[PDB]
Amino acid sequence: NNRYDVTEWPAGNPAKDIGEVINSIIADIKARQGAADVDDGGKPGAVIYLPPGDYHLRTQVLIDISFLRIEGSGHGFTSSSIRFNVPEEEWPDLHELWPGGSRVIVDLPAGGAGDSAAGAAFLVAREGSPRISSVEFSNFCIDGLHFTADGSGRHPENTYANGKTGIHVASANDSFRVTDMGFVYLENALTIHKADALSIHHNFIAECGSCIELRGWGQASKITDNLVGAGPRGHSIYAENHGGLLVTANNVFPRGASSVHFKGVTRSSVTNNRLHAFYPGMVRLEENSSENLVATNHFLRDHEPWTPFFGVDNGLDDLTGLLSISGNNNSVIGNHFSEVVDANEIRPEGATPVIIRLTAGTGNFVSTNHVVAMDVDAASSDSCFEAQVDALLATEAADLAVTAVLVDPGSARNTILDSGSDTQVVADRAVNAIRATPTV
Amino acid sequence: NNRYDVTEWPAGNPAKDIGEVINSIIADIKARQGAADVDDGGKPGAVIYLPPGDYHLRTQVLIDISFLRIEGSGHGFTSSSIRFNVPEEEWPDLHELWPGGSRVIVDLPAGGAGDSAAGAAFLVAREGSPRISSVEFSNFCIDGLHFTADGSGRHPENTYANGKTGIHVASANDSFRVTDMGFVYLENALTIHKADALSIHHNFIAECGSCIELRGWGQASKITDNLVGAGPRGHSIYAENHGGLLVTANNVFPRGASSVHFKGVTRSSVTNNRLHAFYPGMVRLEENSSENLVATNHFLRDHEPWTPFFGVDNGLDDLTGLLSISGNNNSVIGNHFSEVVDANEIRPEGATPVIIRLTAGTGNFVSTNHVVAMDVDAASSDSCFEAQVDALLATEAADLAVTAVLVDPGSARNTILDSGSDTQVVADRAVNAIRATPTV
Amino acid sequence: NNRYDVTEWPAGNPAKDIGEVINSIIADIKARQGAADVDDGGKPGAVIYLPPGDYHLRTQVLIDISFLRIEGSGHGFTSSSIRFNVPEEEWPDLHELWPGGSRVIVDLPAGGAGDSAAGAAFLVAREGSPRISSVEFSNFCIDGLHFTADGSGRHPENTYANGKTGIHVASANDSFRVTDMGFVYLENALTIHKADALSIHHNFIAECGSCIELRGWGQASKITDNLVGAGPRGHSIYAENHGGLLVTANNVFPRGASSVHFKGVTRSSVTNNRLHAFYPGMVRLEENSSENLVATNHFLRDHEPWTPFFGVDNGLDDLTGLLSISGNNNSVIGNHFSEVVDANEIRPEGATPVIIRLTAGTGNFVSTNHVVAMDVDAASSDSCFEAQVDALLATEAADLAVTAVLVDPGSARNTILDSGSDTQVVADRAVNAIRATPTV
């Protein structure tokens, strides 16, 4: 025992309100595990199992205890975004309509003016000592169900706004795991404050406004092997005030405002990811993000190919850069950048797009980065995945002049090696060490 | 419920034909999940559990539904290749003879002249909309049992031919997972057509003719953390017409024809793998494979040390290259190449082996690759793992001249930096930018 | 069946001695699986499940059979190190005191003068043929409970000494997996001899004297996605006489003697890890460790910030190097090194710290490594995680002269490119090819 199955718990009804059921199970664990030091233990925690099923959550789950594992048997993802943009008269012929797996349907109202925490299906919160530790979420689905009108006049299902969060961790935490999950149609998939030695590993986090956000501060954590797709006003991967973070082996696709965004992040590594955006400002190191390694990533920036998101932007223009750095002593090494754009969609009109921009800070080392830039003709089609795939396989283009590296006058004493020809590297040679990539 | 255990299903017998049992379970799921939009769901799918056991499959499983998870409790791998080459009179003294775990023994005949799909233990197929989604295969064993005579006069168990496939996905699919599996003694372990956002993660796929094949087209997928060993007429990792594929953190060992093979693959990353082959042509980018990052891989090419495969080749000679590129605007950065061969086994007689070959395309960037080449004396021994390990630890060699980079006249406007001395880099300096690695 | 739950086994008591229970289950599996070739199988193995719980182990588990899986439902980690250094009168106010999850408490005496194997909770041993294969340990907790006085006069809980091992594999093995575990308060977490195609993946291995040790020899293995923290007389990741090892995507934090230590390791890759130490000698390639790739790692060396470990060293001084190489033909490419030290704590007094040191061997290629060095004021605070995090986020420092690369006269014919200025690279230019990083 200490093993519970939500379909076998005698209180509540998991189809109607799985929140109530899980809170009831948590009360039972605490009632049984009252003593902290009996035969060298006494509070080992528990596992709560969700079989495949459609489970409505109407009461927020409060997780107050260490070593709690909540697990299911399916990440359950299907593209609600595609389905909600299929003409409605065709829905009866679709084999299915909704995500599945071990599915928690989040039916909470939007969070108040206090916060988003109130809109989270699972809230992890505990103050005092020690930090809550080794909570595990595994292999289930959290589904926000619908997005809602936002004043823009866009389809309500394409706004990425509903005030719902999948998992929200409010308190300092240690050794947490989020693995094998599916998150869909949430304004925020996963928000974790004050994380130590966290692992976010092998999840599918897509069609959420903002996917992964590490807030407050943190250390010694990792975000690995995820498939991630956000919305144009949110983050794919975000961290602030982290040290020693490792972000690797993620496949991040559209349509977040950015792929990776750091504020005040130090001594971290963003390496070996595949990153694909429809907008500039893919990787942002801001507010003294320093001594970070950004290595061997594949960056692709192109244009949205799917008609229902034509015109949808993140507000940033082509001078922003694909990689933007404000901070000291970073290392940008061995990245590939593909810039695949339509010259007459470049903004501002007639600008030369920038790839890497150093806006502030000193001592950045940028070496052995390959920039390929291409001028294609933009187009939109109605069939989502066909258009996406055709777009990736298309190479049928003219050449395009770009600025591979732009060092603003506010950044100096950088070293730029083999990351562009002299024309491609716009920088003051008197206060930065520049070696042009050899040419013919 | 929606949870099934194949040993607790009242129809069929999983020891005799687990195929029939699983198909029966799938019919039950469909019978119960008929309605697509009842209380915001209705087709959440299911989980089918295989306890550890030896289960014969005589009827192909047809997977027709989204959010189906099939799981077990052991990848169950043992080297049938070693065992089948042990003298038969010694078999009674072996502690065990066969793979184990949650084991599906594939007893289907070879596929007809239509196709290999008919020889697959699990076939995933569904047409219409939407694409089948979020099917999961986890932590079980698929065993082809024996290889069969192929006309070559080789031992029938060493042919890698039986017409059997582990898992075959014929239809466009989204968010699929194959994790923690074991595949053994199959002509094809895993063949997945038309994949979107697929994850093939942390499997053991070995002693199969061909291991992973991604066919038709695809996008935004990943192949990570696998242990992979194929056969000399097949692929280790293969993809065609994929965009945005990430292949990382795999340990690929002998004896596939290649370690990674791309046809028409674009905007992808093959980075941070350990790759070991007994033959040339380890990593092949062919048929306009363009804008790919190939970074920080460890390549080892040497000679087969195990006597029962002496003389077995993939048909390619030492001029082929360890890495061969036909395509535009790729990035080859920070790889290590160990070429450990016996000079008198080099073919054609008296050739200088090539390491990286650019056969066609423009704009490839090749930078900071270390090539170490060595002339050793070839040998074969009868004890498989002892010989393999001794061979890897052996450094007792003379020096060997190699061509680090060969740029054919059909490839031009490439950039080659610090990837060999001038002698080691055979290329037209007038139409490629070449910087020799500094020497003494 | 072949599925067992230790709380449902009729012999012994898993709370008192889970060792006896598991050994009893193993005898039952062998009694049932006597025949090796009945209908193409007969020894498929088994799965043993540990629900969340506190389980004392007083008898060593002997694992003698292939395809055994032992699994739980929680890695269960909490910092016993922090708790044992909290004043004792405050313990009654802590929410909990001990690790949890599916918890095996190791209550064996320390191993005799024969060996440490006798102190292991789980011993995997079998001689003869074939090698034991595809044993899996997953998602449970192994807890050494306490460290003991060691003659140093340190707190007994801070010695990292108790003679206990989590899992010890004594025999040649194939296709083993250790995944999702938690190890805490063990002198040795995981020791695996003679490993072939092993995967140590996604574990939490911390506050153990020595974490991962691969001994004897091995091949084609991988250590990926682990969180790892050892003690100052032990190893974080250690291997000897391995070929084809891949160590990637690990986040290794203090306070092991080293982060990665190789003896006699060849043709391997240590790439894309985040490594953090409080002492020199972070990555050691020793005793002819040759043809290894060390690429795109983030190294941080700084000072211990937590008062109860002030003064605790690994015995090595600042001339040792962060990366030390004794071996031929290695490749050191694209690493970031942050050296964050207090100039008056540098030892010996007045030394210039070294970052990469080549002590012996020929043909090493060192290219495009960024070294950032800083002089800060050392300090200690009592609040562990606050001090750790503040320390990582602190950049408030003066500049510090370092030797980026030191090539001893005993190492020659190396190539050093863009890994330091001429002053920073101390090497005989007549017998090594040196290119200084361009400067202003």
Do B206 and B228 touch, CB atoms closer than 8 A?
Answer: yes
CB pairs under 8 A between B and C: 249
d(CA C413, CA C419): 16
Q: Torsion angle, CA of C311/C313/C316/C322, rounded to 10 degrees?
A: -110
Q: Contact at 8 Å (CB) between B13 and A17? A: no
Per the CB < 8 A criterion, the answer to whether A328 and A363 are in contact is yes
Residues 6+ apart with CB under 8 A from C429: none
- Burial call C357-395: b when 16+ CB within 10 Å, e when fewer: bbbbbbbbbbbbbbbbbbbbeeeeeeebbebbbbbbbbb
| Inter-residue contact C218 to C196 (CB < 8 Å) | yes
The angle subtended at Cα C29 by Cα C26 and Cα C30, nearest 5°, is: 90
* CA–CA separation, C316 and C209 (whole Å): 17
Radius of gyration over every alpha carbon of chain B, rounded to an integer in angstroms: 23
Structural element, H or E, at residue A248: strand A246-248
The CA distance from C265 to A317, in Å, is 50
Looking at residue C79, its amino acid is S
Closest to C207 measured CA to CA, from C341, C82, C333, C56: C82
| Rg of chain C on CA atoms, in Å | 23
Q: List C-alpha distances in Å: C262 to A291, C201, C230, C243, C313.
A: 27, 19, 16, 11, 20
Q: CA B171, CA B127: separation in Å to the nearest integer?
A: 7
Task: Name the amino acid, one letter, at B187.
Answer: E
| Beta strand ranges found along B100-209 (DSSP E) | 102-106, 120-124, 132-133, 136-138, 141-143, 165-169, 173-174, 177-179, 182-184, 188-196, 199-201, 204-206
Task: Please tell me the distance from the alpha carbon of residue A80 to that of residue A60, in angstroms, as a whole number.
Answer: 23
Backbone angles phi, psi at C216, to 5 degrees: 80, -80
Cβ neighbourhood burial of A342 (10 Å; 0-12, 13-18, 19+): middle
A 302-331 near B (Cβ less than 8 A): none
What is residue B89's three-state secondary structure? helix
Please tell me the distance from the alpha carbon of residue B337 to that of residue A403, in angstroms, as a whole number: 33
Question: Prior bond to B348 cis, omega within 30?
Answer: yes
Q: How far apart are CA C238 and CA C226, in angstroms?
A: 14
> CA B316, B235, B291: angle at the middle one, nearest 5?
90
Q: What is the CATH number of domain B1-440?
A: 2.160.20.10
Is the distance from CB of B99 to CB of B31 less than 8 angstroms? no
Look at residues A45, A205, A215 and name the one whose alpha carbon lies nearest to residue A135.
A45
CA B11 to chain CA mean position, Å: 36
Please name the helix (run of DSSP H) or strand (run of DSSP E) that holds residue C314, with its range, or none.
Answer: none
For chain A, how long is the longest CA-to-CA vector?
Answer: 76
All residues at 6 or more sequence positions from C228 whose CB lies less than 8 Å from its CB, including other chains = C203, C205, C206, C211, C212, C236, C237, C250, C251, C252, C253, C256
Is A252 strand, coil or helix? strand
Give the SS3 label for residue B228: strand
Residue from the list C98, C204, C225 with its beta carbon closest to the beta carbon of A224? C225
Chain B residue closest in CA terms to C264: B393
Strand partners for A332: A294, A366
Query: A27: which 2 tokens?
Result: 């009360």
B-contacting residues of A 135-174, CB under 8 Å?
145
Residue among A133, A139, A171, A215 with most chain C CBs within 10 A, to mutate:
A133
**C141 burial via Cβ count (<10 Å: 0-12, 13-18, 19+):** buried
The DSSP call for residue B45 is: -
Q: How far apart are CA B390 and CA C193, in angstroms?
A: 16
- Whole-angstrom distance, CA of residue B259 vs CA of residue B238: 8
Following DSSP, what letter does each residue of C61-105 receive, concatenated?
Answer: EEE-STTEEEEES------HHHHHTS-GGGGGGSS--S--SEEEE
Closest alpha carbon to C124 in C60, C216, C185, C214? C60
In a 13 Å sphere around the CA of A120, the CA atoms on its Cβ side amount to: 21
**Which SS3 state, helix, strand or coil, does residue B18 take?**
helix
Question: What approach was used to elucidate this structure?
Answer: X-ray
**Within a 10 A sphere around the Cβ of A169, how many other Cβ atoms?**
27
**Residue C312 DSSP class:** -
Of B41, B130, B179, Cβ closest to residue A82 = B130
Q: What residues in C contact A71, CB-CB < 8 Å?
A: 73
**Which value in Å is the resolution of this experimental model?**
2.0
User: CA–CA separation, B352 vs B343, rounded Å?
Assistant: 9
- Return the beta strands (E) in B241-352 as ranges: 242-243, 246-248, 251-253, 258-263, 269-271, 274-277, 283-286, 293-295, 298-301, 323-326, 331-333, 336-341
Asked if residue C141 lies in contact with residue C87, where contact means CB atoms within 8 angstroms, the answer is: no
CB contact A417 to B (< 8 Å): no
Asked if B48 and B6 touch (Cβ cutoff 8 Å), the reply is yes
Q: What 3-state class would DSSP assign to A20?
A: helix
Nearest to C243 among B94, B372, B389 (CB): B389
DSSP, res A80: H
Nearest chain B Cα distance for residue C61, angstroms: 19
Residues in a beta bridge with B349: none
DSSP calls for C340-402:
EE-GGG-SSTT---EEEEEEEEE--EEES-EEEEEE-----BS-HHHHHHHHHH----EE---
CB contact under 8 A, C40 and B105: yes
Q: Which residues pair with C143 in a beta bridge?
A: C105, C184
Nearest-by-Cβ selection for A395 from B45, B290, B334: B290
